[PDB]
Design a protein around this ligand. Structure first.
Ligand SMILES: O=C(c1cc(=O)[nH]c(=O)[nH]1)N1CCN(c2ccc(C(F)(F)F)c(Cl)c2)CC1
Ligand SMILES: O=C(c1cc(=O)[nH]c(=O)[nH]1)N1CCN(c2ccc(C(F)(F)F)c(Cl)c2)CC1
Lengths: 306, 306
């Protein structure tokens, strides 16, 4: 029993983190095989941040402008290239701790673990969701750029996020590992703001099922509803609309609890219209939307990895 | 003078198109160096479309299950792998017509050219925009899967789209060239629908500038406005909000016409509230939103390629 904000074990990622220094700027890199990946704004100085011309800035650099350290060992940079907003540093030594990996781009609503790092050294691990406005609500201080987000599928690390910047509202923006930003953000210091966020409805439903599994049942009721009647109320409270595909994803959780999805939607409808009335669900006084159906199954049924 | 829906010259892409057959299914592939890229649903039969398990389906295939033809020449498949929703077919011969290329992911509102193909043979070229709901309004018939979208930057082809499917409303969905879908779509036959589309405001403004450059001035007026007052009206008509970054992008067009962006916004505000009154702009009776500021500069000032 129990329900916690649970991250993936980070061991397989910790061994890939390195420190990258260019000039007086130091941030984190990801060392896989003989390539080190890091944000390209490592090559920017103060004069360049407002309107960087990255092709120009990179052409004026040589391999010896890049200092790469893995703990004590310094890695010799023998080549460099740019792929979108990510810099790829070819090094002379392939990381012997390279796990089986792949680069995947995630969708809004999906969760992943973040290994926050400073000076190439892992500092902490936490779980977060990609928000519908393509930001994450992370926890990052100065020096954290190049920290990565990941999921673990069996033996395979799926890298999905590299951290680039903090926006004025205190939320965070970055790229996939091919250097393509999540959301309409750019790596220059301009006045960019995240759009309107919404609540991830399929995730709230998954969390309500987790509550039932753990003995929280006070919000249930006898009624049922239709997708269209529910979505009519959800849009009024800035909730993402619910699809038939969402209903199918929640299948394993309705089966385990014997509570139909549209039955559970009727409870959610009541909670949206009446509030919590000072009661809590799984130790929270708000509706939580950063657990996917898969996260709930993983934690309430059991799945491990290497 | 003049203003047309103008696509990029397609020659450099036509020489990369091949035909891929697996079983009784034939679609188009992109042949760059010694790799052929194509949609992975080429390995699906009728029984698999509802719930494909692509890892299973691919493990039961061998290299000789894949027939690749470039015109008459058959290409020998010596290896195969899957990257997200794209299949990568290693072949024995590197395409001697491989141009300088890169794989880029585009943002909503950006435009690109589509080379529609059938049986590996180019059929037509047209220009379209990635909509805010991550679909495109293309023109595609049966057999068009694997057709690609591209931009040309100087000598370099930037591939940004591969066609996978048509949605029930008649709009189109696909991936970038790393196999990651644009939008929340999946390559299985389920009931997926595009979300609400909006009008790309910065593109409408660019088009109004193109009109002024070409002698259409009847919609102009003396007033001016602020971003917040304009965005207040725009959101009421399902227009994307306008940012300061958008204002900066439009800079070259305000300079050439001597009409400030916020001046032009006041004209747009009037057109939204009063309509066209039976008059046309650049031969259209509707506000066009599929020309970026860059497209207008390219066509109204002049830029060519190799
Ligand atoms: O390390 C942090 C940090 C991260 C965080 O999440 N929170 C926090 O407080 N600090 N930095 C802030 C972002 N920064 C940066 C440098 C250059 C550029 C560019 F592209 F314009 F050249 C940009 Cl866009 C950002 C590097 C330093
Ligand atoms: O060629 C066209 C076509 C394209 C178009 O844009 N318009 C049009 O009319 N036809 N096809 C329709 C899509 N199709 C397909 C096959 C398998 C799957 C999957 F993933 F489930 F296995 C899917 Cl999702 C789609 C292949 C054939």
């Amino acid at each position: 029993s129990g329900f916690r904000k649970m991250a993936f074990p980070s061991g397989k990622v910790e061994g890939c983190m390195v420190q990258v220094t260019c000039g007086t700027t130091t941030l984190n890199g990801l060392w896989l095989d003989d390539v080190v990946y890091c944000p390209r704004h490592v090559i920017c100085t103060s004069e360049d941040m407002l309107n960087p011309n990255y092709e120009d800035l990179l052409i004026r650099k040589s391999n010896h402008n890049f200092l790469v350290q893995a703990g004590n060992v310094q890695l010799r940079v023998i080549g460099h290239s740019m792929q979108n907003c990510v810099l790829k540093l070819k090094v002379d030594t392939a990381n012997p701790k390279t796990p089986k990996y792949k680069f995947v781009r995630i969708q809004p609503g999906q969760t992943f673990s973040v290994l926050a790092c400073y000076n190439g050294s892992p500092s902490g691990v936490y779980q977060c969701a990609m928000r519908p406005n393509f930001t994450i609500k992370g926890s990052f201080l100065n020096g954290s750029c190049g920290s990565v987000g990941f999921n673990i599928d069996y033996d395979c690390v799926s890298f999905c996020y590299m951290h680039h910047m903090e926006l004025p509202t205190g939320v965070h923006a970055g790229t996939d590992l091919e250097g393509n930003f999540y959301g309409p953000f750019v790596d220059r210091q301009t006045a960019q703001a995240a759009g309107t966020d919404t609540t991830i409805t399929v995730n709230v439903l998954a969390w309500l099922y987790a509550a039932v599994i753990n003995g929280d049942r006070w919000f249930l009721n006898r009624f049922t509803t239709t997708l269209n009647d529910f979505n009519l109320v959800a849009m009024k409270y800035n909730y993402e609309p619910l699809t038939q595909d969402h209903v199918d994803i929640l299948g394993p959780l309705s089966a385990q609890t014997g509570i139909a999805v549209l039955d559970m939607c009727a409870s959610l409808k009541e909670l949206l219209q009446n509030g919590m009335n000072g009661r809590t669900i799984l130790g929270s006084a708000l509706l939580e939307d950063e657990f996917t159906p898969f996260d709930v199954v993983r934690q309430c049924s059991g799945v491990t990895f290497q």
